[PDB]
Amino acid sequence: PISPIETVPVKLKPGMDGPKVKQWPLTEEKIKALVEICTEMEKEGKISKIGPENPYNTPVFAIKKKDSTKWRKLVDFRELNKRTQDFWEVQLGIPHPAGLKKKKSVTVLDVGDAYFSVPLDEDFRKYTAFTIPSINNETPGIRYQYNVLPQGWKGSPAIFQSSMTKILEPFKKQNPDIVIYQYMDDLYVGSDLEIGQHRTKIEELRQHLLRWGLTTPDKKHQKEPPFLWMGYELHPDKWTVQPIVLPEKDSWTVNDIQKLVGKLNWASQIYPGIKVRQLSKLLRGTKALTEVIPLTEEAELELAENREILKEPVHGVYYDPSKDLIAEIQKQGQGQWTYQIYQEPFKNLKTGKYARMRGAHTNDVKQLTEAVQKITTESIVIWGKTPKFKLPIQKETWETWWTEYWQATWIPEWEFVNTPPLVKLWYQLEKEPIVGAETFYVDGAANRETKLGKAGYVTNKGRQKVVPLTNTTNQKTELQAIYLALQDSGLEVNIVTDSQYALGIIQAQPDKSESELVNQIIEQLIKKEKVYLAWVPAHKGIGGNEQVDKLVSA
Amino acid sequence: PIETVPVKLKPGMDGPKVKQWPLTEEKIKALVEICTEMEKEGKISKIGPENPYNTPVFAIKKKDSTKWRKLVDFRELNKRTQDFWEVQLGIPHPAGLKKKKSVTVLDVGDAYFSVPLDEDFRKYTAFTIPSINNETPGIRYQYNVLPQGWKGSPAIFQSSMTKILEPFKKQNPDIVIYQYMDDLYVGSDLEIGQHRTKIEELRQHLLRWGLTTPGYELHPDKWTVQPIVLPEKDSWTVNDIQKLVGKLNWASQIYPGIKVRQLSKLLRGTKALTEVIPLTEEAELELAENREILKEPVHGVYYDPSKDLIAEIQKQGQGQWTYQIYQEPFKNLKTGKYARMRGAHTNDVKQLTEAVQKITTESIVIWGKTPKFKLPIQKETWETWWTEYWQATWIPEWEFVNTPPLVKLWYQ
DNA sequence: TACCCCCCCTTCGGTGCTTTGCACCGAAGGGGGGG
Ligand SMILES: Cc1cn([C@H]2C[C@H](N=[N+]=[N-])[C@@H](COP(=O)(O)OP(=O)(O)OP(=O)(O)O)O2)c(=O)[nH]c1=O
Ligand SMILES: [Ca+2]
């Protein structure tokens, strides 16, 4: 054979052998387009006829190239992949257009037959053995071993990406001012060269890629804006996503909502303020992907205003490494947040959204910190720096939160933006007991078998209560006992519990909860003017903690 | 041209496969430049995706350094070489190091580049440099010499090191020298001026053996333990005695002599929290005897070299931080408190980073080990910012805890 | 009826402390997107 470029050694998982599985009953319609290009491979040295000395077999099929009449070949290696050695992918992420610095001229060129231009490893080739079908079952069909990277293997992408870099390395060193965004075979090349010199250098690189036997087809090649790159339309000074089609179905299934949600998550990167909360509330705990489910009046409202954002076209800008990065966040309610990252006011680099609900009980400050960290990670990926933050929280609101919180927390350089709704702490536990406020010693208990329990309290002024509780747990009664003391107390109240569980939940100042009992405690705490929570150990003969421990066990 | 010591992983164990986390621009620049010159000097050489192993890499500046320093996160590799640097080629610990009035840390990590590495082990040192916005896929490398920050590196070089030291260990007999990875700890009872001179002598004594030193000054005798303390009040409220009894109740798991009966008696009624309670004779006495037991040492606490060290840290607010180092629960080998660290009253993460570094340094001097940390922080908060404030050439093991202060045990 | 990468949103099951309840998290299958 012949030898284009430096190969990569491959192995199997030690003490294991190759792929012996029988072919799929493929329809003769695909077989026509199949054996056509298949026989053309052997001429170029891409595939080879093998003797039965090769005892391996792997299935094969083909799917049409999207937006093309051409067909693309795929070999099912699922069983070969299970027994093939592990790699470490060199694809660490995806480039974003909002990271592109502005370039005077830009060229985008695909590599024709990308995997097939890279030589496989000599000794490993035997394991690619597969057989080609026929119109009848009489003729057997030739068995072949790949001499290059097959579409469908688990090592094909990683080896291609790494080989491509070694090829582009000498050129990149000769042309330091050329920006080559290398993603698989898709190449974005840009420069500040004048368009005449730029295309000249493009040809040197097409020659340099050709010197290693890498094709640069003209049809894939694009010389004029707006470039189609990574599903975007790149214009000289602006960019946008390629248009987004929302399904028009009258009756929705589960696979319909999924397609809708994903399309919206994709749109949320530039179209500001996309919300997925109420559409995703429909997919919780559903069995069938095919099941039909109705649209709530909430999710119907959400899809309408999400279509109105998509109605008017939007666009992003490019990165100016000289000017600062700015990220401003707004609160959308129900644990939903959106953000815009920009440099010049009102010209966005990109947008996004953080709606993750982390934990059973949370508040708006916790969720804002989680969103700031999501943006910081996202921003260090794309621009390698942390943006300056414009946050809808008062400076003294934050200063109070992080100083008092028992866990370490922080936010980078930021300034207050007065855009409502503002983030606030809806209540504040006193650091010291309240003089003149009634003091409530609460307690609760449940029977592990009966699921029946009591929750009540005693006070210094003689007040009392006990409540029977049905199908409850020791935790719920300890929370319930506090709910009572909040209901039956004045605007200022001291509450003494022996529950570690409840005091932990309340001291973190939540404004939202999955538990409905907690929301009612939250609701009461906002109403109060001064609340003081305290803790004593149980069964120590302490205070009224012993007296109410007696009432609720009876 | 030196003989390569063979290294094998722990029995039945695979090399480190750890993803590379995003890096800032200034750190990627510093790394590419550090990695370029290290390649033309043959210390490293590029590799390919056939290598299934990877280790994260980033850059730091030491305290006041101003010059970038490369740092690799070998915690996953070190956990899988554990047989090597403990059982086989390990170092004895000089228990007298903690007793010296001054100790200086020097970065000798540049000498590990002298010795080559076992060829079969270079497959586990793979690390990847990321690219801003994924302009380029990951550029991979691996180490041809002893890597800076691997725990097998100081053990292999130990033979070469003790020879380089021997003339100066003889020229100055009573000066203590300990080596923990990329750092060399040297301590004397000499005065500050005499001490810093013998360091420069040790620097030149290292120069003629082919090593530079891009010094940290400790004072192990100075460090002070933190004890559990009871408040002083001329009048006690119900909440005061309730808080007090809860604290003593918690402290009874360490000092068993703690008694609560006469103070619990004072609470017997159902009273308002702010109401004043005069102390009885036996309560005043039970309080007195309790204050004395907390002066004592914990009975039966001692260090076990076979066991791992644990380090808990609690944020006390207004710049204060507390910490306790233990092996078994409630058997505390040391307790302490830090205050007015860098970043106080403005940045929590920086202080917490500064605290981990100080605590780890103390454990290295005292026991020659790095403890596993229980950190009061959320995982996402810490994993984001911690590299920005890290100034040390080692990286301890840590986990994250959420333990609200039901009782303020370690600080009033 | 293939492979590799990134993202969100949901379930589920393992883990440890708040304890045999509840809360957290990470793996995984749904989708979108790139080649
Ligand atoms: C779209 C697609 C691409 N790939 C890989 C394999 C392909 N390499 N090859 N041969 C690369 C690039 O595919 P592609 O760039 O889309 O087209 P290609 O096969 O390289 O031939 P061309 O039309 O003349 O340009 O991505 C895949 O494995 N499965 C897919 O569905
Ligand atoms: Ca192609």
Coordinates of all heavy atoms in Angstrom, one line a residue, chain C residues 6-32:
Chain C
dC6 N1 -21.8 19.6 24.3 C2 -23.2 19.8 23.7 N3 -24.0 18.6 23.4 C4 -23.6 17.3 23.7 C5 -22.3 17.0 24.3 C6 -21.4 18.2 24.6 O2 -23.5 20.9 23.5 N4 -24.5 16.2 23.4 C1' -21.0 20.7 24.6 C2' -21.4 21.4 25.9 C3' -20.5 20.7 27.0 C4' -19.2 20.6 26.2 O4' -19.6 20.2 24.8 O3' -20.3 21.5 28.2 C5' -18.2 19.5 26.7 O5' -18.8 18.2 26.7 P -17.9 16.9 26.9 OP1 -17.0 17.1 28.1 OP2 -18.9 15.8 26.9
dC7 P -21.3 21.2 29.4 OP1 -20.8 22.0 30.5 OP2 -21.4 19.7 29.6 O5' -22.7 21.7 28.9 C5' -22.9 23.1 28.8 C4' -24.3 23.4 28.3 O4' -24.5 22.7 27.0 C3' -25.4 23.0 29.2 O3' -25.6 24.0 30.2 C2' -26.5 22.8 28.2 C1' -25.8 22.3 26.9 N1 -25.9 20.8 26.8 C2 -27.1 20.3 26.3 O2 -28.1 21.0 26.0 N3 -27.1 18.9 26.1 C4 -26.1 18.2 26.4 N4 -26.2 16.8 26.3 C5 -24.9 18.7 26.9 C6 -24.8 20.1 27.1
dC8 P -26.5 23.7 31.5 OP1 -26.6 24.9 32.3 OP2 -26.1 22.4 32.0 O5' -28.0 23.4 30.9 C5' -28.8 24.5 30.5 C4' -30.2 24.0 30.1 O4' -30.1 22.9 29.3 C3' -31.1 23.7 31.4 O3' -32.4 24.2 31.2 C2' -31.1 22.2 31.4 C1' -30.9 21.8 29.9 N1 -30.2 20.5 29.7 C2 -30.9 19.4 29.2 O2 -32.1 19.6 28.9 N3 -30.2 18.3 29.0 C4 -28.9 18.2 29.3 N4 -28.3 17.0 29.1 C5 -28.2 19.3 29.8 C6 -28.9 20.4 30.0
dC9 P -33.4 24.2 32.5 OP1 -34.4 25.2 32.2 OP2 -32.5 24.4 33.7 O5' -33.9 22.7 32.5 C5' -35.0 22.4 31.6 C4' -35.5 21.0 32.0 O4' -34.6 20.0 31.5 C3' -35.8 20.7 33.4 O3' -37.1 20.2 33.6 C2' -34.7 19.7 33.8 C1' -34.5 19.0 32.5 N1 -33.2 18.3 32.4 C2 -33.1 17.0 31.9 O2 -34.2 16.4 31.6 N3 -31.9 16.4 31.9 C4 -30.8 17.0 32.2 N4 -29.6 16.4 32.1 C5 -30.9 18.4 32.7 C6 -32.1 19.0 32.7
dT10 P -37.6 19.8 35.1 OP1 -39.0 20.3 35.2 OP2 -36.6 20.3 36.1 O5' -37.6 18.3 35.2 C5' -38.4 17.5 34.3 C4' -38.0 16.0 34.4 O4' -36.7 15.8 34.0 C3' -38.1 15.5 35.8 O3' -39.3 14.7 36.0 C2' -36.9 14.6 36.0 C1' -36.1 14.7 34.7 N1 -34.7 15.0 34.9 C2 -33.7 14.1 34.6 O2 -34.0 13.0 34.1 N3 -32.4 14.5 34.8 C4 -32.0 15.7 35.3 O4 -30.8 15.9 35.5 C5 -33.0 16.6 35.6 C7 -32.6 18.0 36.2 C6 -34.3 16.3 35.4
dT11 P -39.6 14.0 37.4 OP1 -41.0 13.6 37.5 OP2 -39.1 14.9 38.5 O5' -38.7 12.7 37.4 C5' -39.0 11.7 36.5 C4' -37.9 10.6 36.5 O4' -36.6 11.1 36.4 C3' -37.9 9.8 37.8 O3' -38.2 8.4 37.5 C2' -36.5 10.1 38.4 C1' -35.7 10.5 37.2 N1 -34.5 11.4 37.5 C2 -33.3 10.9 37.4 O2 -33.0 9.8 37.1 N3 -32.3 11.8 37.8 C4 -32.5 13.1 38.2 O4 -31.5 13.9 38.4 C5 -33.9 13.6 38.2 C7 -34.2 15.0 38.7 C6 -34.8 12.7 37.9
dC12 P -38.5 7.4 38.7 OP1 -39.2 6.3 38.1 OP2 -39.1 8.2 39.8 O5' -37.0 6.9 39.2 C5' -36.1 6.4 38.2 C4' -34.8 6.1 38.8 O4' -33.9 7.3 38.9 C3' -34.9 5.5 40.2 O3' -34.0 4.3 40.3 C2' -34.4 6.6 41.1 C1' -33.4 7.3 40.2 N1 -33.1 8.7 40.6 C2 -31.8 9.2 40.7 O2 -30.9 8.4 40.4 N3 -31.6 10.5 41.1 C4 -32.6 11.3 41.3 N4 -32.4 12.5 41.7 C5 -34.0 10.8 41.3 C6 -34.2 9.5 40.9
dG13 P -34.1 3.3 41.6 OP1 -35.2 2.4 41.2 OP2 -34.2 4.1 42.8 O5' -32.7 2.6 41.6 C5' -31.7 3.1 40.8 C4' -30.6 3.6 41.7 O4' -30.4 5.0 42.0 C3' -30.6 3.0 43.1 O3' -29.2 2.7 43.5 C2' -31.2 4.1 44.0 C1' -30.4 5.3 43.4 N9 -31.1 6.6 43.7 C8 -32.4 6.8 43.8 N7 -32.7 8.1 44.0 C5 -31.4 8.7 44.0 C6 -31.1 10.0 44.2 O6 -31.9 11.0 44.4 N1 -29.7 10.2 44.2 C2 -28.8 9.3 44.0 N2 -27.5 9.6 44.0 N3 -29.1 8.0 43.8 C4 -30.4 7.8 43.8
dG14 P -28.9 1.6 44.6 OP1 -28.7 0.3 43.9 OP2 -29.9 1.6 45.7 O5' -27.5 2.1 45.2 C5' -26.5 2.6 44.3 C4' -25.8 3.8 44.9 O4' -26.4 5.1 44.9 C3' -25.3 3.5 46.4 O3' -23.9 3.7 46.5 C2' -26.1 4.5 47.2 C1' -26.4 5.7 46.2 N9 -27.7 6.3 46.4 C8 -28.9 5.8 46.2 N7 -29.9 6.6 46.5 C5 -29.3 7.8 46.9 C6 -29.8 9.0 47.4 O6 -31.0 9.3 47.5 N1 -28.8 9.9 47.7 C2 -27.4 9.7 47.6 N2 -26.6 10.7 48.0 N3 -26.9 8.5 47.2 C4 -27.9 7.6 46.9
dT15 P -23.2 3.8 47.9 OP1 -21.8 3.6 47.7 OP2 -24.0 2.9 48.9 O5' -23.5 5.3 48.4 C5' -22.5 6.3 48.1 C4' -22.7 7.4 49.1 O4' -24.0 7.9 49.1 C3' -22.4 7.0 50.6 O3' -21.2 7.6 51.0 C2' -23.7 7.5 51.4 C1' -24.4 8.3 50.3 N1 -25.9 8.2 50.4 C2 -26.7 9.2 50.8 O2 -26.2 10.3 51.1 N3 -28.0 9.0 50.8 C4 -28.7 7.8 50.6 O4 -29.9 7.7 50.6 C5 -27.8 6.7 50.2 C7 -28.4 5.4 49.8 C6 -26.5 7.0 50.1
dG16 P -20.8 7.5 52.6 OP1 -19.3 7.9 52.6 OP2 -21.2 6.2 53.1 O5' -21.6 8.6 53.3 C5' -21.2 10.0 53.3 C4' -22.1 10.8 54.2 O4' -23.6 10.6 53.9 C3' -22.0 10.5 55.7 O3' -22.1 11.7 56.4 C2' -23.2 9.6 55.9 C1' -24.3 10.3 55.1 N9 -25.4 9.4 54.7 C8 -25.3 8.1 54.4 N7 -26.5 7.6 54.1 C5 -27.4 8.6 54.3 C6 -28.8 8.7 54.1 O6 -29.6 7.7 53.8 N1 -29.3 9.9 54.4 C2 -28.6 11.0 54.8 N2 -29.2 12.2 55.0 N3 -27.2 11.0 54.9 C4 -26.7 9.8 54.7
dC17 P -21.7 11.7 58.0 OP1 -20.2 11.9 58.1 OP2 -22.3 10.5 58.7 O5' -22.5 13.0 58.5 C5' -23.0 13.9 57.6 C4' -24.5 14.3 58.0 O4' -25.6 13.4 57.5 C3' -24.7 14.4 59.5 O3' -25.6 15.4 59.8 C2' -25.3 13.0 59.8 C1' -26.3 12.9 58.7 N1 -26.8 11.5 58.4 C2 -28.2 11.3 58.1 O2 -28.9 12.2 58.2 N3 -28.6 10.0 57.9 C4 -27.7 9.0 57.8 N4 -28.2 7.8 57.5 C5 -26.3 9.2 58.0 C6 -25.9 10.5 58.3
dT18 P -25.9 15.9 61.3 OP1 -25.5 17.3 61.4 OP2 -25.4 14.9 62.2 O5' -27.5 15.9 61.3 C5' -28.2 17.1 61.5 C4' -29.7 16.8 61.3 O4' -30.1 17.1 59.9 C3' -30.1 15.4 61.5 O3' -31.4 15.3 62.2 C2' -30.2 14.8 60.1 C1' -30.6 16.0 59.3 N1 -30.1 16.0 57.9 C2 -30.9 15.7 56.8 O2 -32.1 15.5 57.0 N3 -30.3 15.7 55.6 C4 -29.0 16.0 55.3 O4 -28.6 16.0 54.1 C5 -28.2 16.3 56.4 C7 -26.7 16.6 56.3 C6 -28.7 16.3 57.7
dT19 P -31.6 14.2 63.3 OP1 -32.6 14.8 64.3 OP2 -30.3 13.7 63.7 O5' -32.4 13.1 62.5 C5' -32.2 11.7 62.8 C4' -32.6 10.8 61.6 O4' -31.6 10.8 60.7 C3' -33.0 9.4 62.0 O3' -34.4 9.2 61.8 C2' -32.2 8.5 61.1 C1' -31.2 9.4 60.4 N1 -29.8 9.2 60.9 C2 -29.1 8.1 60.5 O2 -29.5 7.3 59.8 N3 -27.8 8.0 61.0 C4 -27.1 9.0 61.8 O4 -26.0 8.8 62.1 C5 -27.9 10.1 62.2 C7 -27.3 11.2 63.0 C6 -29.2 10.2 61.7
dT20 P -35.2 8.1 62.5 OP1 -35.9 8.7 63.7 OP2 -34.3 6.9 62.8 O5' -36.3 7.7 61.5 C5' -36.5 6.4 61.1 C4' -35.9 6.1 59.7 O4' -34.5 6.1 59.9 C3' -36.4 4.9 59.0 O3' -37.0 5.2 57.8 C2' -35.1 4.0 58.9 C1' -34.0 5.0 59.1 N1 -32.9 4.4 60.0 C2 -31.7 4.2 59.4 O2 -31.3 4.5 58.3 N3 -30.8 3.6 60.3 C4 -31.0 3.2 61.6 O4 -30.2 2.6 62.3 C5 -32.4 3.4 62.1 C7 -32.8 2.9 63.5 C6 -33.2 4.0 61.2
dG21 P -38.4 6.0 57.7 OP1 -39.1 5.7 59.0 OP2 -39.0 5.8 56.4 O5' -37.9 7.5 57.8 C5' -38.7 8.4 58.6 C4' -38.3 9.8 58.4 O4' -36.8 10.1 58.5 C3' -38.7 10.4 57.1 O3' -39.2 11.7 57.2 C2' -37.5 10.3 56.2 C1' -36.3 10.4 57.2 N9 -35.2 9.5 56.9 C8 -35.3 8.2 56.6 N7 -34.1 7.6 56.4 C5 -33.2 8.6 56.7 C6 -31.8 8.6 56.7 O6 -31.1 7.6 56.5 N1 -31.3 9.8 57.1 C2 -32.0 11.0 57.3 N2 -31.3 12.1 57.6 N3 -33.3 11.0 57.3 C4 -33.9 9.8 57.0
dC22 P -39.7 12.6 56.0 OP1 -40.6 13.7 56.6 OP2 -40.3 11.7 55.0 O5' -38.4 13.3 55.5 C5' -37.6 13.9 56.5 C4' -36.3 14.4 55.9 O4' -35.1 13.5 55.7 C3' -36.5 15.1 54.5 O3' -35.8 16.3 54.5 C2' -35.8 14.0 53.5 C1' -34.6 13.6 54.4 N1 -34.1 12.2 54.0 C2 -32.7 12.0 54.2 O2 -32.0 12.9 54.6 N3 -32.2 10.8 53.8 C4 -33.0 9.8 53.4 N4 -32.5 8.7 53.0 C5 -34.4 10.1 53.2 C6 -34.9 11.3 53.5
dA23 P -36.1 17.4 53.3 OP1 -36.7 18.6 54.0 OP2 -36.8 16.7 52.2 O5' -34.6 17.8 52.8 C5' -33.6 17.8 53.8 C4' -32.2 17.5 53.1 O4' -31.8 16.1 52.9 C3' -32.1 18.1 51.7 O3' -30.9 18.8 51.5 C2' -32.2 16.9 50.8 C1' -31.5 15.8 51.6 N9 -31.9 14.5 51.3 C8 -33.2 14.0 51.0 N7 -33.3 12.8 50.8 C5 -32.0 12.3 50.8 C6 -31.4 11.0 50.7 N6 -32.1 9.9 50.4 N1 -30.0 10.9 50.8 C2 -29.3 12.0 51.2 N3 -29.8 13.3 51.3 C4 -31.1 13.4 51.2
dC24 P -30.7 19.8 50.2 OP1 -30.3 21.1 50.8 OP2 -31.9 19.6 49.3 O5' -29.4 19.1 49.5 C5' -28.3 18.7 50.3 C4' -27.5 17.8 49.5 O4' -28.0 16.4 49.5 C3' -27.3 18.1 48.0 O3' -26.0 18.4 47.7 C2' -27.9 17.0 47.2 C1' -27.8 15.8 48.2 N1 -28.9 14.8 48.0 C2 -28.6 13.5 47.8 O2 -27.4 13.1 47.8 N3 -29.5 12.5 47.7 C4 -30.8 12.9 47.7 N4 -31.8 12.0 47.6 C5 -31.2 14.3 47.9 C6 -30.2 15.2 48.1
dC25 P -25.5 19.0 46.3 OP1 -24.5 20.1 46.5 OP2 -26.8 19.3 45.5 O5' -24.8 17.8 45.6 C5' -24.3 16.7 46.3 C4' -23.9 15.6 45.4 O4' -25.1 14.6 45.5 C3' -23.7 16.0 44.0 O3' -22.7 15.2 43.4 C2' -25.0 15.7 43.4 C1' -25.5 14.5 44.1 N1 -27.0 14.3 44.1 C2 -27.5 13.0 44.2 O2 -26.8 12.0 44.2 N3 -28.9 12.9 44.1 C4 -29.7 14.0 44.1 N4 -31.0 13.8 44.1 C5 -29.1 15.3 44.0 C6 -27.8 15.4 44.0
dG26 P -21.8 15.8 42.2 OP1 -20.7 16.5 42.8 OP2 -22.7 16.4 41.3 O5' -21.2 14.5 41.5 C5' -21.3 13.2 42.1 C4' -21.9 12.2 41.3 O4' -23.3 12.0 41.4 C3' -21.7 12.4 39.8 O3' -21.6 11.1 39.2 C2' -23.0 13.0 39.3 C1' -24.0 12.2 40.2 N9 -25.3 12.9 40.4 C8 -25.4 14.2 40.7 N7 -26.7 14.6 40.9 C5 -27.4 13.4 40.8 C6 -28.8 13.1 40.9 O6 -29.7 13.9 41.1 N1 -29.0 11.7 40.7 C2 -28.1 10.8 40.4 N2 -28.6 9.5 40.3 N3 -26.8 11.0 40.3 C4 -26.5 12.3 40.5
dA27 P -20.7 10.9 37.8 OP1 -19.3 10.5 38.2 OP2 -20.9 12.2 37.0 O5' -21.4 9.7 37.1 C5' -21.7 8.5 37.8 C4' -23.0 7.9 37.3 O4' -24.2 8.7 37.7 C3' -23.2 7.8 35.7 O3' -23.8 6.6 35.4 C2' -24.1 9.0 35.4 C1' -25.0 9.0 36.6 N9 -25.6 10.3 36.9 C8 -25.0 11.5 37.0 N7 -25.9 12.5 37.3 C5 -27.1 11.8 37.3 C6 -28.4 12.3 37.5 N6 -28.7 13.6 37.8 N1 -29.4 11.4 37.5 C2 -29.2 10.2 37.3 N3 -28.0 9.6 37.0 C4 -27.0 10.5 37.1
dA28 P -23.7 6.1 33.8 OP1 -23.4 4.7 33.9 OP2 -22.8 7.0 33.1 O5' -25.2 6.3 33.3 C5' -26.3 6.1 34.2 C4' -27.6 6.3 33.5 O4' -28.2 7.6 33.9 C3' -27.5 6.4 32.0 O3' -28.7 6.0 31.4 C2' -27.4 7.9 31.7 C1' -28.3 8.5 32.8 N9 -28.1 9.8 33.2 C8 -26.9 10.5 33.3 N7 -27.0 11.7 33.7 C5 -28.4 11.9 33.9 C6 -29.2 13.0 34.4 N6 -28.6 14.1 34.7 N1 -30.5 12.8 34.5 C2 -31.0 11.6 34.2 N3 -30.4 10.5 33.8 C4 -29.1 10.7 33.7
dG29 P -28.7 5.1 30.1 OP1 -28.8 3.7 30.5 OP2 -27.6 5.5 29.2 O5' -30.1 5.5 29.3 C5' -31.3 5.5 30.1 C4' -32.3 6.5 29.5 O4' -32.1 7.8 30.2 C3' -32.2 6.8 28.0 O3' -33.4 7.0 27.4 C2' -31.4 8.1 28.0 C1' -32.0 8.8 29.3 N9 -31.1 9.9 29.8 C8 -29.8 9.9 29.9 N7 -29.3 11.0 30.4 C5 -30.5 11.8 30.6 C6 -30.6 13.1 31.2 O6 -29.7 13.8 31.6 N1 -31.9 13.5 31.2 C2 -33.0 12.7 30.8 N2 -34.2 13.3 30.9 N3 -32.9 11.5 30.3 C4 -31.6 11.1 30.3
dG30 P -33.6 7.3 25.9 OP1 -34.6 6.4 25.4 OP2 -32.2 7.3 25.2 O5' -34.2 8.8 25.8 C5' -35.6 9.0 25.9 C4' -35.9 10.5 26.0 O4' -35.3 11.1 27.3 C3' -35.3 11.4 25.0 O3' -36.1 11.3 23.8 C2' -35.4 12.8 25.6 C1' -35.0 12.4 27.0 N9 -33.6 12.6 27.2 C8 -32.6 11.7 27.2 N7 -31.4 12.2 27.4 C5 -31.6 13.5 27.6 C6 -30.7 14.6 27.9 O6 -29.4 14.5 28.0 N1 -31.3 15.8 28.1 C2 -32.7 16.0 28.0 N2 -33.1 17.2 28.1 N3 -33.5 15.0 27.7 C4 -32.9 13.8 27.5
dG31 P -35.3 11.5 22.3 OP1 -36.2 11.0 21.3 OP2 -34.0 10.8 22.5 O5' -35.1 13.0 22.2 C5' -36.2 13.9 22.3 C4' -35.8 15.3 22.6 O4' -35.2 15.4 23.9 C3' -34.7 16.0 21.7 O3' -35.3 16.4 20.5 C2' -34.3 17.1 22.6 C1' -34.2 16.4 24.0 N9 -32.9 15.8 24.2 C8 -32.5 14.5 24.1 N7 -31.3 14.3 24.4 C5 -30.8 15.5 24.7 C6 -29.5 15.9 25.1 O6 -28.5 15.2 25.3 N1 -29.4 17.3 25.4 C2 -30.5 18.2 25.3 N2 -30.2 19.5 25.6 N3 -31.7 17.8 24.9 C4 -31.8 16.5 24.6
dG32 P -34.4 16.5 19.2 OP1 -35.3 16.6 18.0 OP2 -33.3 15.5 19.3 O5' -33.6 17.9 19.4 C5' -34.4 19.1 19.6 C4' -33.5 20.3 20.0 O4' -32.9 20.0 21.3 C3' -32.3 20.4 19.1 O3' -32.7 21.1 17.9 C2' -31.4 21.2 20.0 C1' -31.6 20.5 21.3 N9 -30.7 19.3 21.5 C8 -31.0 18.0 21.3 N7 -30.0 17.2 21.5 C5 -29.0 18.0 21.9 C6 -27.7 17.7 22.3 O6 -27.1 16.6 22.4 N1 -26.9 18.9 22.6 C2 -27.4 20.1 22.6 N2 -26.6 21.1 23.0 N3 -28.7 20.5 22.2 C4 -29.4 19.4 21.9

